[PDB]
Amino acid sequence: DNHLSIVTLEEAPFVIVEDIETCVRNTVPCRKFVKINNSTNEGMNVKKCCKGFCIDILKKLSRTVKFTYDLYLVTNGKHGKKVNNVWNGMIGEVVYQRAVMAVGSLTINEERSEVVDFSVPFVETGISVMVSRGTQVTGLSDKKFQRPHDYSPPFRFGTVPNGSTERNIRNNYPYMHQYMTRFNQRGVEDALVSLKTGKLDAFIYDAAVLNYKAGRDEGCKLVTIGSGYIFATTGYGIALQKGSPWKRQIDLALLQFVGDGEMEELETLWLTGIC
Amino acid sequence: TRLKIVTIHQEPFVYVKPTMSDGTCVKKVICTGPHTVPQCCYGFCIDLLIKLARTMNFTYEVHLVADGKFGTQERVNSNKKEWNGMMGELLSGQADMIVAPLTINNERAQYIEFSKPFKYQGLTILVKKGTRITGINDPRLRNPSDKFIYATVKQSSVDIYFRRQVELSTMYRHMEKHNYESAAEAIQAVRDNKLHAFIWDSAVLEFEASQKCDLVTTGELFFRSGFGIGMRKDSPWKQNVSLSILKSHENGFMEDLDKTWV
Numbered sequence A: 001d002n003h004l005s006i007v008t009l010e011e012a013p014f015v016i017v018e019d020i021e022t023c024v025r026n027t028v029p030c031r032k033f034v035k036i037n038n039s040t041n042e043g044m045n046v047k048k049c050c051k052g053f054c055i056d057i058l059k060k061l062s063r064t065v066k067f068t069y070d071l072y073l074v075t076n077g078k079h080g081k082k083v084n085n086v087w088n089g090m091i092g093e094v095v096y097q098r099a100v101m102a103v104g105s106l107t108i109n110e111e112r113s114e115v116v117d118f119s120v121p122f123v124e125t126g127i128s129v130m131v132s133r134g135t136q137v138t139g140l141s142d143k144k145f146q147r148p149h150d151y152s153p154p155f156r157f158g159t160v161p162n163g164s165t166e167r168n169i170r171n172n173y174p175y176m177h178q179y180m181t182r183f184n185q186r187g188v189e190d191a192l193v194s195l196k197t198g199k200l201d202a203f204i205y206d207a208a209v210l211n212y213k214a215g216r217d218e219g220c221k222l223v224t225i226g227s228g229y230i231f232a233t234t235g236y237g238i239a240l241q242k243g244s245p246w247k248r249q250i251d252l253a254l255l256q257f258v259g260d261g262e263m264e265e266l267e268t269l270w271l272t273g274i275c
Numbered sequence B: 001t002r003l004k005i006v007t008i009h010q011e012p013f014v015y016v017k018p019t020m021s022d023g024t025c026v027k028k029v030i031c032t033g034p035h036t037v038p039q040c041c042y043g044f045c046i047d048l049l050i051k052l053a054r055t056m057n058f059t060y061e062v063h064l065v066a067d068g069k070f071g072t073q074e075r076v077n078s079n080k081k082e083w084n085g086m087m088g089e090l091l092s093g094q095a096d097m098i099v100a101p102l103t104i105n106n107e108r109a110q111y112i113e114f115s116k117p118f119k120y121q122g123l124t125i126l127v128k129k130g131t132r133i134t135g136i137n138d139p140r141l142r143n144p145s146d147k148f149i150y151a152t153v154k155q156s157s158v159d160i161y162f163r164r165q166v167e168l169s170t171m172y173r174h175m176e177k178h179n180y181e182s183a184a185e186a187i188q189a190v191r192d193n194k195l196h197a198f199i200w201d202s203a204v205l206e207f208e209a210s211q212k213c214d215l216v217t218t219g220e221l222f223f224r225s226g227f228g229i230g231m232r233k234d235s236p237w238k239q240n241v242s243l244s245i246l247k248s249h250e251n252g253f254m255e256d257l258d259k260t261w262v
């Protein structure tokens, strides 16, 4: 009751996983359930090591709010999507009460907030467009995106599906959404490769990660369009169960980290760029 | 029962203008404010209020905070503490909801409940064009003397900010002698060179540098912060007010208010 099952997911620099006996300096223990084969429910927890901005937030939360935890990595999906009205991902781990809370680059939107409770946002984010070459594109709302085939030839751009970004483009821009799907990227790394090689003209994704990526890009050729503009501004948050007793102390603790300078320190520790 | 809405004068979020002769005034609402008199409120937060009102189907009455303050907690003198400003009105019952550029912090959140942020912004510094300083770390700011004078708004979140850290104490003791009653007055005192630097919300300050082209910001946010709707610790409306704010970020409404008012 003071010991909490917490779920997380890897996405640098917020959560970074390293192979391990004991987890060394500034990392914490996080287990990941790895199956024996693809034709069995059988599996085994592999002991690994977690670090990063959100891991540091977690330590700090644990210190101040006074709980212990067992941290594990999500296996059934990623951040969280509702599929046939059933939540997968970190969101579903909380929703089906496997985890007391979820920590990581977890974007707050309306639909997730219907089924879990979220802390105050502690990282600004939204939706940004990253390019690799010069462009005149305004933002997500540019005609090149909304009505792509108005142009011959059209722009080729995509996201990583099944997260808060795709869920947003699907609600707001139906035509853009069905045009984009053929350019779905399997991950941020993949997209960046496509951008640099020119098989992708633009990559539409979470602003905080995009800003980070551009921050650590060698040659500094990757930028976010429009002065790093952010459509649909929101934040990462700690997802807790609906009606959680923990939300209050977690919130005040977070807001205290802000007054402490503790957040700014985390920010410079992990999010310092070279560009 | 109707909702009592307190707000505060703060362009471009709440414009305050006098009703014309008939008692009548872009969506505009009748609001009463300092003994009280009918007046015309409009702007960003008003548009938001009207969006929440229609969305969640409620009626409201708007008035301006009596002491013209955002709100901090001061010692009564002794022993008791009390909240002034919009914060005090909400806690007392004179308001049911604060709709305003109300900054979220640990101190206020201890007592009230904020919606999710309808506006992400931060703190920056306003100056008159001829002035140049690096930022919040310039020698003239961190090592104050009445030869270079800067202020913030009294009983504001920025006030709380500087009083909170022992390490910010000398800055705070310098600001204490120069702090203004309203941001409007402080912005005015910067144009007249009566004030050298105004430390305040970037959302507000960059809108003024945007139109009063004799003022500029330096530079540069030095602190992130956000605005949310104030409600008391109960509250039935609290969960659905957040969902609405999230919805409006997501579907473009908040982005539109930006472009209509900033």
Ligand SMILES: CC1=NCC(CNC(=O)c2cnc(CNS(=O)(=O)c3ccc(F)c(F)c3)c(C)n2)=[SH]1
Binding pocket: A120, A121, A122, A123, A124, A208, A235, A254, A255, A258, A263, A264, A267, A271, B104, B117, B120, B121, B224, B225, B226, B227
């Ligand atoms: C990239 C990075 N973005 C942010 C980073 C560190 N976190 C902060 O600076 C911060 C600031 N303010 C708050 C609390 N109030 S909030 O109104 O809801 C708000 C406002 C602006 C924000 F940016 C934000 F996250 C949240 C919190 C919890 N954290 S790194």
Ligand SMILES: N[C@@H](CCC(=O)O)C(=O)O
Binding pocket: A079, A080, A105, A106, A107, A108, A160, A162, A163, A164, A165, A166, A205, A206
């Ligand atoms: N941060 C996102 C993941 C990436 C995205 O789709 O923008 C989420 O929690 O869904």
